[PDB]
């Protein structure tokens, strides 16, 4: 193929990956930051405080947004397989 | 619409008809039916044997080729 | 029309040559074998049950599952042939029907349509007239899909166990403790307690 | 099957996972937070002192609730393998 | 064909590894958790049927 | 009624090919090697003793376990065969019975019932009338379950050691220290001082009884 | 319930029975029995040989299939 | 053919590897250092919030400089395969 | 003396079990397990290739069997040519040094267990232990000895790792992994003391 | 036990071969009372026994190799 016929496909694929992983990473970072700021405000000395808020936030985000990410990924893969015969030329 | 199994069936059936015809001709000659000559009986028997040996060789080649194709590491 | 005896035995031996292909692509051996391999991978024990043990178990399960089809072939096709009632051609044609029905029972209409459209076959009225060259690949594809479905579903409880042990270890601060070493004995315990082997074999048999 | 069925199966899966983890995670979090609050109030500057009680608490949880987390999980697994011949299609 | 067949499974692997490590559980093997999801993606897309369709239409 | 010599030789040489299958699905071997496959995992060294050493040790242990069954087969069936007082068919019928009893005593009733139901067999009056087609896979299933039970139980003291070492490492603030490498020599200590190998083989042999 | 072991036993018994009948007839003919002819003895021996060769070939194919199936990587 | 040519072969190859990997590694290092100094300034300490922006930064790095890497590596491989029959011994 | 063709058949058949003879009858398992454990100790599971470790164990096995090979040559190789003893009386006579060596290296507990596993009550003397009881007992004893040697090798490297981690913690560092720092020090200790030659000397002394 | 049975079988096969060879050797010298048909039948029986031993050895070696190749 061509570097472009490849760079564009990789860019689209990693855009799909970024869209898939954005909600989970975002809620994880927000929850961790909030717990850490609350901890620093009270001057509590601990490192394992944020893990459980992290896990429940990620779990709830998965429950809320699962259909959306799964449908987006399924559609992307379906169009990739349909377009595959034309990728070779 | 060409089926390889169909062609194999056709060749196998043709071999079978040749063998059956030779067998029936020998059968009739043994029963003393006028109009049958020994030389033609032996010639048709040998032709049936040649056809069957050709079928055997074709089957051997096909089976060998199938086993060589079917044993590759994917 | 009946094949001569030498042609008959030539056909018989040549067909006996194709035995593993029939076992893999016409019976339930492939799905059971795939599920067993995925299950072995799922327990974290890549080589605990030797391949020969699982292959023998899959063979016995396949024989038990296909016993009704073999009985139908014997009663309807092989028995008259052995009593010289019918020729080899018609015996094979009659024996194809029960196996064809079994394979059609466990195939997906979409794959059948794909292979029919690919082979440029004319419109076919009902399931009565579908060529074996069309049905065999569709059945193989459906078996692959079903086996992957079953394996992916089976992968769930061990994933639950791994996640819960990893979270328990992490909430204690144990940052550099790997969870596989702790999870493997508990995976074995979970599979033992639920009577996993017989339950999974019963589930595989019931799905056929 | 449809994607929605996969989402429902995963939903009961992570519900069972949360039910398994919470008896342990909650008590570990409570013990850690209590010790950290006491430490901050007493200015006893040492993080590692929060680790020792937690294990005991976790162990206590097991010996007080190990049967239940053992039983419930089984009541899920025995169902799942029994639903295997009815999810395909 | 193969190097672009590889793409979605790499996407799933990277997404799962990133989520797991960002959440904190960096000691887990991402491939072990990822394999069931790869099977799920393959069966929910109808990977076999679509792959045969693509292979046939490549000619 | 006796088979011809040619047929007897053909059957004997053909049945000689099923030796690994018979060993795995009919003897003790399946329970032994599998446990070994787990024990080397518990010690933390997947390399462990080499694969061939473990396989041969399992073979010797299997022979020692089946010595009574082999002796009974030799006495009841093969001895009249060598001394010409029995045929090959009758020898095959008679010699399998002690091995069938050995397989049945280690066979869980649930698996046997499952395979009966799956073969649609009629009402079996008593253990003695159980077909081999039903006893073989059920025995293999029960064998796998028992091997997994033994392996999980074996996994316990090494888990104890790993947990204790990790707790000691974390209680001192040494959070960045991987406890697997530290705990491996102590696992070797535990297996050496308690005489782990001899104890395990004795336990396996007693388990089969 | 059709069992493959029963069919194999039946086939082996048939081969053994044919071989035993041919051997007994040849033994009786050697002993000077009147009602047995040489051509029948030779034809029966050849038929027994053909049957045993068929059994050997079927065994070879079955063993090849079994060794192929049991060599998988599951 | 001469060992000087061989060792030069290794050097230039592994400098090509260094050029390929330097932008991504340097971007990740800069993001990590920036997040760490911000944590030190704000007195916030969670080991997970430094992992979040690193992925986004490194993934953007392929967006911006990816074509350059793809063009450099292809040119290297093309030249190596073209000069293969002249460094034979 | 039986037929020459049968002798050829038996010889070629016995040639197949050469890995079994090397593993079960000689000491090769001990050196191979010691090498594996030592490699696991340094923290690098692929630093010397498996091939090199296997060949080193093979050379060590050849030297440490050289006295037994010499006894075999005296009792079997030579008199088989002078035909004072041959075939039976000799193969067994030549195997006798192997029996003496394996009796020397076998613990009593393993032999006792494998005897009570074979219902061999009247086994009273210690030079008439059958091969069936002697072999697996010898293998188990070798496994125990190899594990003990591996632990003894483990002790100094574990000490070095612990010391490095303790100094890192005392110096104020709480995040630096001690394995990266301790690996080159483990190597410099291993080379400086010349660990390898003393290890082989001790293994030869370990018999 | 098993080694004893193998040794007994090998001894019987070699005794067959030795008896056939000795009978043929005696017949070569012109010794009376030894007939050609008996010599040929004994030679063929010895060959059959030796071929059976070879086949049994092959099956046993193949079984041992298959067993020893398992992944524990």
Q: How far apart are CA G14 and CA C30, in angstroms?
A: 35
Run of H or E including I23: none
Q: For J54, name the nearest residue in chain I, comparing CA atoms only.
A: I9
- Note whether F106 and F146 are within 8 A (CB): yes
Question: Which is nearest to G60 in space by CA: J63, C17, B68?
Answer: C17
Tokens of E48: 């076999």
Say how many CB pairs under 8 Å bridge F and I.
93
Q: How far apart are CA F117 and CA C70, in angstroms?
A: 18
Sequential DSSP letters for I53-73: HHHHHHHHHHHHHHHHHHHHI
Record: contact A37-H44, CB cut-off 8 A: yes
**Residue count (chain I):** 207
Compute φ and ψ for F107, nearest 5 degrees.
-100, 125
* B63 to C25, F178, G53, I159, I203: CA distances (angstroms): 18, 58, 20, 66, 57
Question: Which is nearest to C198 in space by CA: F120, F130, F114?
Answer: F114
Interface test with F, best of G7, G10, G16, G23 (most F CBs within 10 A): G16
DSSP I127: S
- Note whether I172 and I146 are within 8 A (CB): no
Long-range contacts of G14-23 (CB under 8 A, 24+ apart): G14/G51, G15/F4, G15/F7, G15/G48, G15/G51, G15/G52, G15/G55, G16/F3, G16/F4, G16/F7, G18/G47, G18/G48, G18/G51, G19/F4, G19/F6, G19/F7, G19/G48, G19/G51, G19/G52, G20/F4, G21/G48, G22/G47, G22/G48, G23/F4
Q: How far apart are CA C156 and CA C45, in angstroms?
A: 16
Chains A and C in direct contact, meaning 3 or more beta-carbon pairs closer than 8 angstroms: yes
Looking at the complex, does the CB of residue A45 fall below 8 Å from at least one CB of chain C?
no
Question: Which distant-in-sequence residues (6+ apart) come within 8 Å of H5 by Cβ?
Answer: H87
Looking at the complex, does the CB of residue G19 fall below 8 Å from at least one CB of chain F?
yes
Q: How far apart are CA A26 and CA E16, in angstroms?
A: 15
Q: Based on C-alpha coordinates, what's the Rg of chain I?
A: 23
Record: contact C145-E48, CB cut-off 8 A: yes
Q: Is F41 exposed, middle or buried (0-12, 13-18, 19+ CB in 10 A)?
A: buried
Q: End-to-end alpha-carbon separation of chain A, Å?
A: 8
Q: How far apart are CA A57 and CA D64, in angstroms?
A: 28
Q: Is G70 exposed, middle or buried (0-12, 13-18, 19+ CB in 10 A)?
A: middle
Q: For C58, name the nearest residue in chain F, comparing CA atoms only.
A: F137
Q: How far apart are CA C113 and CA H64, in angstroms?
A: 45
- Note whether F76 and F96 are within 8 A (CB): no
DSSP C4: P
Question: Which distant-in-sequence residues (6+ apart) come within 8 Å of A27 by Cβ?
Answer: A57, A58, A60, A61
Looking at the complex, does the CB of residue C77 fall below 8 Å from at least one CB of chain G?
no
Interface test with H, best of A7, A21, A22, A42 (most H CBs within 10 A): A7
Q: For E36, name the nearest residue in chain C, comparing CA atoms only.
A: C152
Distance to chain A for C133, nearest Cα, Å = 25
DSSP C127: T
Resolution of the coordinates in A? 3.3
Looking at the complex, does the CB of residue F117 fall below 8 Å from at least one CB of chain G?
no
Question: Which distant-in-sequence residues (6+ apart) come within 8 Å of D75 by Cβ?
Answer: none
Distance to chain C for J34, nearest Cα, Å = 45
Question: Which is nearest to F158 in space by CA: F13, F39, F19?
Answer: F39
Distance to chain C for E49, nearest Cα, Å = 6
Q: How far apart are CA H11 and CA H5, in angstroms?
A: 10
Record: contact F111-C198, CB cut-off 8 A: yes
Q: For A26, name the nearest residue in chain H, comparing CA atoms only.
A: H52
* D neighbours by CB contacts (3+ pairs under 8 Å): A, C, E, F
Q: How far apart are CA I22 and CA I29, in angstroms?
A: 8
Question: Strands (DSSP E) along chain H, which ranges?
Answer: none
How many Cβ atoms are within 10 Å of I68's Cβ, its own excluded? 17
- Note whether I105 and I142 are within 8 A (CB): yes
The three-state DSSP-derived secondary structure of chain D is: CCHHHHHHHHHHHHHHHHHHHHHHHHHHHHHHHHHHHHHHHHCCCCHHHHHHHHHHHHHHHHHHHHHHHHHHHHHHHHHHHHCHHHHCC
Q: Is G24 exposed, middle or buried (0-12, 13-18, 19+ CB in 10 A)?
A: exposed
Ranges of each domain in chain A: 1-89
Question: Strands (DSSP E) along chain B, which ranges?
Answer: none
- Note whether H84 and H2 are within 8 A (CB): no
Q: How far apart are CA J46 and CA J15, in angstroms?
A: 9
Looking at the complex, does the CB of residue C121 fall below 8 Å from at least one CB of chain G?
no
Looking at the complex, does the CB of residue A48 fall below 8 Å from at least one CB of chain C?
yes
Tokens of C133: 């060259």
Residue with tokens 């097991």: D62
- Note whether C168 and D21 are within 8 A (CB): yes
Tokens of G13: 């018994």
What distance lies between CA D32 and its chain's CA centroid?
16
Q: How far apart are CA A55 and CA C131, in angstroms?
A: 54
Q: How far apart are CA C5 and CA F143, in angstroms?
A: 47
Looking at the complex, does the CB of residue F47 fall below 8 Å from at least one CB of chain J?
no
* C neighbours by CB contacts (3+ pairs under 8 Å): A, B, D, E, F, G, J
Looking at the complex, does the CB of residue B2 fall below 8 Å from at least one CB of chain C?
no
DSSP C183: H
* A neighbours by CB contacts (3+ pairs under 8 Å): C, D, E, H
Q: How far apart are CA I63 and CA I46, in angstroms?
A: 26
| Burial annotation A20-37 (CB, 10 A radius, 16+ → b, else e) | bbebbbebbbebbbebbe
Question: Which distant-in-sequence residues (6+ apart) come within 8 Å of F8 by Cβ?
Answer: F88
Q: How was this structure determined?
A: cryo-EM
Distance to chain D for A45, nearest Cα, Å = 6
């Amino acid at each position: 193929m061509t570097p472009e016929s490849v760079m564009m496909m990789g860019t689209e694929a990693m855009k799909v990956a970024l869209a898939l992983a954005a909600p989970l990473l975002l809620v994880a970072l927000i929850t961790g930051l909030i717990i850490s700021i609350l901890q620093a405000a009270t001057q509590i000395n601990e490192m394992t405080l944020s893990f459980i808020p992290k896990i429940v936030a990620v779990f709830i985000a998965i429950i809320v947004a699962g259909p959306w990410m799964l449908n987006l990924l399924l559609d992307y893969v379906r169009t990739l397989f349909s377009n595959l015969p034309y990728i070779i030329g | 619409t060409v089926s390889f199994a169909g062609q194999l069936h056709a060749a196998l059936d043709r071999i079978s008809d040749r063998q059956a015809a030779a067998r029936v001709q020998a059968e009739k000659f043994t029963l003393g039916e006028p109009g049958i000559a020994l030389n033609d009986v032996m010639a048709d028997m040998q032709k049936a044997s040649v056809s069957m040996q050709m079928g055997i060789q074709v089957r051997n080649k096909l089976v060998a080729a199938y086993q060589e194709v079917m044993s590759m590491q994917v | 029309q009946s094949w001569s005896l030498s042609v008959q035995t030539l056909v018989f031996i040549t067909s006996l040559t194709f035995l593993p292909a029939i076992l893999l692509m016409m019976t339930s051996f492939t799905r059971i074998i795939i599920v067993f391999g995925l299950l072995r991978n799922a327990l974290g024990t890549p080589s605990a049950p030797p391949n020969q043990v699982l292959l023998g178990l899959a063979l016995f399960l396949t024989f038990f599952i296909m016993s009704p089809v073999i009985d139908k072939i014997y009663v309807d096709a092989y028995q008259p042939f052995s009593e010289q009632k019918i020729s080899m051609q018609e015996a094979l044609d009659k024996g194809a029907q029960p196996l064809r029905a079994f394979m059609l029972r466990q195939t997906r209409e979409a794959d059948l349509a794909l292979f029919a459209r690919l082979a440029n076959s004319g419109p076919l009225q009902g399931p009565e007239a579908v060529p074996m060259r069309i049905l065999l690949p569709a059945y193989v594809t459906s078996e692959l899909k079903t086996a992957f479905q079953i394996g992916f579903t089976i992968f769930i409880p061990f994933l639950i166990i791994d996640l819960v042990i990893a979270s328990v270890l992490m909430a204690l601060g144990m940052m550099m403790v790997p969870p596989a070493t702790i999870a493997l004995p508990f995976k074995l315990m979970l599979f033992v307690l639920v009577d996993g082997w017989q339950l999974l074999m019963g589930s595989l048999a019931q799905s056929f």
